[PDB]
């Protein structure tokens, strides 16, 4: 971890390429919509917290969902199901023990049945051809976080929060690779708490100069600013807990100095 780090970081960059949705996927879905997906991920956040699940779990879940939706038309009645199975699976993949299936059925207002949720699990696996260890933003933040000097909880929680916020809006967050969004979120969080910036250590590791971030950075800012007003709130809620240092309270900069 002090030896592979680079090997790892290299490989995640390689992986994040192969594990990528298609960007245009939402407009080719007859019956559903970026909005609809927002409602959904939001819901997952909330499940996240109810069952007290690691954040990576939720990041995985969305990633699965996004690729599942990039091959398979779904009807709006069945989205919450896809989400439920995506969540079940990731919990099975990343948690020490996962909620039972019963709970996952419960949490939908028994709108679907155990055998329904279990059937979809399977189809989802089928469709991802079992490829589940997708690199996420939350992974690259954690790699990134090594290069703080020094460390700072506020910064970390903040970068996290922005990370999750990116989860919610396929537009334009799907055109960005996680490693990038994770940079973006990192520089913004840095910037916001301490006025510092995306460090040379990381620029040299990541090959990402600040300027290469700017596109992604900008959307993310816009988002940070608008989050209190966003149609969808479960995250801001989440990131009030003192577990996360109140960071979703803190005041967004109105400018970035770019």
């Amino acid at each position: 971890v002090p030896d592979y780090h680079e090997d790892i970081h290299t490989y995640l960059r390689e992986m994040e390429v192969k594990c990528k949705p298609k960007v245009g996927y939402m407009k080719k879905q007859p019956d559903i919509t970026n909005s609809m997906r927002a409602i959904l991920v939001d819901w997952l956040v909330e499940v996240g917290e109810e069952y007290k699940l690691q954040n990576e779990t939720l990041h995985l879940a969305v990633n699965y969902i996004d690729r599942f939706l990039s091959s398979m038309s779904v009807l709006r009645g069945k989205l919450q199901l896809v989400g439920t199975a995506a969540m079940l699976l990731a919990s099975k993949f990343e948690e020490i023990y996962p909620p039972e299936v019963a709970e996952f059925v419960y949490i939908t207002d028994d709108t679907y049945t155990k055998k329904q949720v279990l059937r979809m699990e399977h189809l989802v696996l089928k469709v991802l051809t079992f490829d589940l260890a997708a690199p996420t933003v939350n992974q690259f933040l954690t790699q990134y976080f090594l290069h703080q000097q020094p460390a700072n909880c506020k910064v970390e929680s903040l970068a996290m929060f922005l990370g999750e916020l990116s989860l919610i809006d396929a537009d334009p967050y799907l055109k960005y690779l996680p490693s990038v969004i994770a940079g973006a979120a990192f520089h913004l969080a840095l910037y916001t708490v301490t006025g510092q910036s995306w460090p040379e250590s990381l620029i040299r590791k990541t090959g990402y100069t600040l300027e290469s971030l700017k596109p992604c950075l900008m959307d993310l800012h816009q988002t940070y600013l608008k989050a209190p007003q966003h149609a969808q709130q479960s995250i801001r809620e989440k990131y009030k807990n003192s577990k996360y240092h109140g960071v979703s309270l803190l005041n967004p900069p109105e400018t970035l100095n770019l």
Partner: peptide, 8 residues
């Protein structure tokens, strides 16, 4: 939270 039959 939580318990929810998302209407779309």
């Amino acid at each position: 939270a939580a318990a929810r039959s998302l209407i779309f």
